Design an enzyme around this catalytic site. Structure first.
Site, PDB file in Angstrom:
ATOM      1  N   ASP A   1      20.657  27.831  -4.615  1.00  0.00           N
ATOM      2  CA  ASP A   1      20.411  28.942  -5.603  1.00  0.00           C
ATOM      3  C   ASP A   1      20.521  30.258  -4.759  1.00  0.00           C
ATOM      4  OD1 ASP A   1      19.422  29.533  -8.421  1.00  0.00           O
ATOM      5  OD2 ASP A   1      18.427  30.843  -7.025  1.00  0.00           O
TER       6      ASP A   1
ATOM      7  N   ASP B   1      19.404  33.175  -5.553  1.00  0.00           N
ATOM      8  CA  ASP B   1      18.450  34.435  -5.417  1.00  0.00           C
ATOM      9  C   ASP B   1      16.761  33.883  -5.567  1.00  0.00           C
ATOM     10  OD1 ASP B   1      18.140  33.659  -8.127  1.00  0.00           O
ATOM     11  OD2 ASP B   1      18.550  35.289  -9.065  1.00  0.00           O
TER      12      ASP B   1
ATOM     13  N   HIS C   1       5.179   8.239 -11.372  1.00  0.00           N
ATOM     14  CA  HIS C   1       5.353   6.611 -11.761  1.00  0.00           C
ATOM     15  C   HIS C   1       6.697   6.332 -10.750  1.00  0.00           C
ATOM     16  CE1 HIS C   1       6.482   3.308 -14.609  1.00  0.00           C
ATOM     17  NE2 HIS C   1       7.553   3.147 -13.969  1.00  0.00           N
ATOM     18  N   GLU C   2       7.708   6.896 -10.702  1.00  0.00           N
ATOM     19  CA  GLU C   2       8.860   6.981  -9.739  1.00  0.00           C
ATOM     20  C   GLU C   2       8.612   6.707  -8.447  1.00  0.00           C
ATOM     21  OE1 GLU C   2      10.913   5.561 -11.538  1.00  0.00           O
ATOM     22  OE2 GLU C   2      10.463   6.668 -13.651  1.00  0.00           O
TER      23      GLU C   2
ATOM     24  N   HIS D   1       6.868   3.665  -7.384  1.00  0.00           N
ATOM     25  CA  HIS D   1       7.519   2.641  -6.958  1.00  0.00           C
ATOM     26  C   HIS D   1       7.932   2.509  -5.457  1.00  0.00           C
ATOM     27  CE1 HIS D   1       8.084   0.632 -10.851  1.00  0.00           C
ATOM     28  NE2 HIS D   1       8.607   1.766 -11.520  1.00  0.00           N
TER      29      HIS D   1
ATOM     30  N   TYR E   1      10.443  -7.483  -8.674  1.00  0.00           N
ATOM     31  CA  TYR E   1      10.564  -6.790  -9.981  1.00  0.00           C
ATOM     32  C   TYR E   1      10.929  -7.624 -11.131  1.00  0.00           C
ATOM     33  CZ  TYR E   1      11.263  -2.502 -12.621  1.00  0.00           C
ATOM     34  OH  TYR E   1      11.017  -1.289 -13.643  1.00  0.00           O
TER      35      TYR E   1
ATOM     36  N   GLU F   1       5.248  -2.394 -12.485  1.00  0.00           N
ATOM     37  CA  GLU F   1       5.318  -1.456 -13.580  1.00  0.00           C
ATOM     38  C   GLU F   1       3.780  -0.852 -13.691  1.00  0.00           C
ATOM     39  OE1 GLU F   1       7.049   0.305 -15.400  1.00  0.00           O
ATOM     40  OE2 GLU F   1       8.309  -0.133 -13.768  1.00  0.00           O
TER      41      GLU F   1
ATOM     42  N   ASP G   1      -4.083  12.397 -20.049  1.00  0.00           N
ATOM     43  CA  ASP G   1      -4.179  11.150 -20.865  1.00  0.00           C
ATOM     44  C   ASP G   1      -3.924  10.084 -20.397  1.00  0.00           C
ATOM     45  OD1 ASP G   1      -1.198  11.080 -21.179  1.00  0.00           O
ATOM     46  OD2 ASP G   1      -1.376  12.894 -22.268  1.00  0.00           O
TER      47      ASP G   1
ATOM     48  N   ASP H   1      14.628  -7.355 -20.119  1.00  0.00           N
ATOM     49  CA  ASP H   1      13.640  -6.558 -19.200  1.00  0.00           C
ATOM     50  C   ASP H   1      13.072  -6.989 -17.852  1.00  0.00           C
ATOM     51  OD1 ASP H   1      12.375  -4.040 -18.584  1.00  0.00           O
ATOM     52  OD2 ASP H   1      10.610  -4.660 -19.873  1.00  0.00           O
TER      53      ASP H   1
ATOM     54  N   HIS I   1       8.400  -4.148 -18.305  1.00  0.00           N
ATOM     55  CA  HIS I   1       7.888  -2.909 -19.206  1.00  0.00           C
ATOM     56  C   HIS I   1       6.953  -3.140 -20.183  1.00  0.00           C
ATOM     57  CE1 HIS I   1      11.246  -1.252 -16.585  1.00  0.00           C
ATOM     58  NE2 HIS I   1      10.456  -0.212 -16.693  1.00  0.00           N
TER      59      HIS I   1
HETATM   60  C1  LIG Z   1      12.428   4.100 -20.333  1.00  0.00           C
HETATM   61  C2  LIG Z   1      12.895   2.754 -20.129  1.00  0.00           C
HETATM   62  C3  LIG Z   1      11.793   2.341 -19.129  1.00  0.00           C
HETATM   63  N1  LIG Z   1      11.568   2.848 -17.909  1.00  0.00           N
HETATM   64  C4  LIG Z   1      10.241   3.298 -17.403  1.00  0.00           C
HETATM   65  O1  LIG Z   1       9.334   2.757 -17.978  1.00  0.00           O
HETATM   66  C5  LIG Z   1      10.563   4.466 -16.384  1.00  0.00           C
HETATM   67  C6  LIG Z   1      10.554   5.732 -16.701  1.00  0.00           C
HETATM   68  C7  LIG Z   1       9.358   6.228 -17.522  1.00  0.00           C
HETATM   69  C8  LIG Z   1       7.939   6.280 -16.929  1.00  0.00           C
HETATM   70  C9  LIG Z   1       9.613   7.350 -18.316  1.00  0.00           C
HETATM   71  N2  LIG Z   1      11.479   4.093 -15.448  1.00  0.00           N
HETATM   72  P1  LIG Z   1      11.473   2.735 -14.126  1.00  0.00           P
HETATM   73  O2  LIG Z   1      10.399   1.878 -14.628  1.00  0.00           O
HETATM   74  O3  LIG Z   1      11.417   3.333 -12.975  1.00  0.00           O
HETATM   75  C10 LIG Z   1      13.136   2.134 -14.595  1.00  0.00           C
HETATM   76  N3  LIG Z   1      13.331   1.009 -13.543  1.00  0.00           N
HETATM   77  C11 LIG Z   1      14.407   0.525 -13.050  1.00  0.00           C
HETATM   78  O4  LIG Z   1      15.728   1.084 -13.285  1.00  0.00           O
HETATM   79  O5  LIG Z   1      14.366  -0.671 -12.410  1.00  0.00           O
HETATM   80  C12 LIG Z   1      15.716  -1.022 -11.985  1.00  0.00           C
HETATM   81  C13 LIG Z   1      16.207  -0.857 -10.663  1.00  0.00           C
HETATM   82  C14 LIG Z   1      16.932   0.383 -10.437  1.00  0.00           C
HETATM   83  C15 LIG Z   1      17.394   0.416  -9.065  1.00  0.00           C
HETATM   84  C16 LIG Z   1      17.168  -0.392  -8.318  1.00  0.00           C
HETATM   85  C17 LIG Z   1      16.369  -1.485  -8.342  1.00  0.00           C
HETATM   86  C18 LIG Z   1      16.068  -1.882  -9.533  1.00  0.00           C
HETATM   87 CA   LIG Z   2       0.529  10.705 -19.685  1.00  0.00          CA
HETATM   88 CA   LIG Z   3      18.840  31.644  -9.392  1.00  0.00          CA
HETATM   89 CA   LIG Z   4      -0.223  14.297 -20.829  1.00  0.00          CA
HETATM   90 ZN   LIG Z   5       8.752   1.793 -13.427  1.00  0.00          ZN
END
Ligand SMILES: CCCNC(=O)[C@H](CC(C)C)NP(=O)(O)CNC(=O)OCc1ccccc1
Ligand SMILES: [Ca+2]
Ligand SMILES: [Ca+2]
Ligand SMILES: [Ca+2]
Ligand SMILES: [Zn+2]
Ligand SMILES: [Ca+2]
Length: 316
Positions: free
Chosen positions: A57, A59, A142-143, A146, A157, A166, A185, A226, A231
């Site tokens: 970026d 600035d 969450h990410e 992982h 997984y 998860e 929450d 899934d 999930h």
């Molecule tokens: C919306 C669909 C479900 N995803 C989820 O619950 C969350 C995101 C939420 C918190 C907003 N994403 P996540 O659980 O990290 C998705 N998982 C996922 O893609 O795993 C599969 C995977 C991807 C790359 C390498 C190995 C395995």
């Molecule tokens: Ca929340």
């Molecule tokens: Ca900028």
């Molecule tokens: Ca919140």
């Molecule tokens: Zn996840």
């Protein structure tokens, strides 16, 4: 990159102003040198090649609409780093201050976010199911969680281990949200999910069934969708965690709540000292009971509450 640490200002996905740690060398980059070996945020430019380019970026002001997902991915990664360091004495996801990398603007209309084995990746959403997903602090945490799981328990997984994986991400996503203390929450993704619908969320930990996710082992999904319902069946463990913290009577079983901090200590210890790649729900119960025993004693309320909670969700 090599440069000097600077402080930029910008606006996140929800329109809120925040300061961000940047690095100056010709441009101002989304590179925060104040935490571990850095937090780095990249532009994927609507494509799927990763990581893309380190966010530059001119600035040090990040108020453009295009900037917003980057501001939040960068800032909330910082908050998550702080949570793990300050609360659990853990330095980044590997425990050794690994550089934390995120890419935003991944693909087009992409209704998801993920850890790809090496970095966090955030879609922008399609504007209907999601807005840019880094706008949710629980999502970012969450990410990153992982990555923590992958470096520690290594929960495979799929099926029960994958549902634990998860739930661990939802639990710590939520604990990080409470740590930051802005509209916290026990819901998941409410800040970025379905902008046209108020009051909903992607998942609920307090009442997983509100979205059709199971809240008892007898309602577990055993099909192949899934990754065997990772999930979906996470609801069973999310509910147990919610009960441990907050208490309640669920299917007639009463649980005495012990609070969020103790929930976090118990599950962090289970994750890092007891769980293995193949742990199932019953083994998670044992791991949590042992963790609470280590921390609080065999005769403690904390141990009794862990047992109550798993009883309540039908996990022996
Ligand atoms: C919306 C669909 C479900 N995803 C989820 O619950 C969350 C995101 C939420 C918190 C907003 N994403 P996540 O659980 O990290 C998705 N998982 C996922 O893609 O795993 C599969 C995977 C991807 C790359 C390498 C190995 C395995
Ligand atoms: Ca929340
Ligand atoms: Ca900028
Ligand atoms: Ca919140
Ligand atoms: Zn996840
Ligand atoms: Ca909504």
């Amino acid at each position: 990159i090599t440069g000097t640490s600077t402080v930029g200002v910008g606006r996140g996905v929800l329109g809120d102003q925040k300061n961000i740690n940047t690095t100056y060398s010709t441009y101002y980059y989304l590179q925060d040198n104040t935490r571990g070996n850095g937090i780095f945020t990249y532009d994927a430019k609507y494509r799927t090649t990763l990581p893309g380019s380190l966010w530059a970026d001119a600035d040090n002001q990040f108020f453009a609409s295009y900037d917003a997902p980057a501001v939040d991915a960068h800032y909330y990664a910082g908050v998550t780093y702080d949570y793990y360091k300050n609360v659990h004495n853990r330095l980044s996801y590997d425990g050794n201050n690994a550089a934390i990398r995120s890419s935003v603007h991944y693909s087009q209309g992409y209704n998801n976010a993920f850890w790809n084995g090496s970095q966090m990746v955030y879609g922008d959403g399609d504007g209907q199911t999601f807005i840019p997903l880094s706008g949710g602090i629980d999502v970012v945490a969450h990410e990153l969680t992982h990555a923590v799981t992958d470096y520690t328990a290594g929960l495979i997984y799929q099926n029960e281990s994958g549902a634990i994986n998860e739930a661990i991400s939802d639990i710590f996503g939520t604990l990080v949200e409470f740590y930051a203390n802005k509209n916290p929450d026990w819901e998941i993704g409410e800040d970025v999910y379905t902008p046209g619908i108020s009051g909903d969320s992607l998942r609920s930990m307090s009442d997983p069934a509100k979205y059709g996710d199971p809240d008892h082992y007898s309602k577990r999904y055993t099909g192949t969708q899934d990754n065997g319902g990772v999930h979906i069946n996470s609801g069973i463990i999310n509910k147990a965690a919610y009960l441990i913290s907050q208490g309640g009577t669920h299917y007639g079983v009463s649980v005495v709540g012990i609070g969020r901090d103790k929930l976090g200590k118990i599950f962090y210890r289970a994750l890092t000292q007891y769980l293995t790649p193949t742990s199932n729900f019953s083994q998670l119960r044992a791991a949590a009971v042992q963790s609470a025993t280590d921390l609080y004693g065999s005769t403690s309320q904390e141990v009794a509450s862990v047992k109550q909670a798993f009883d309540a969700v039908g996990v022996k």
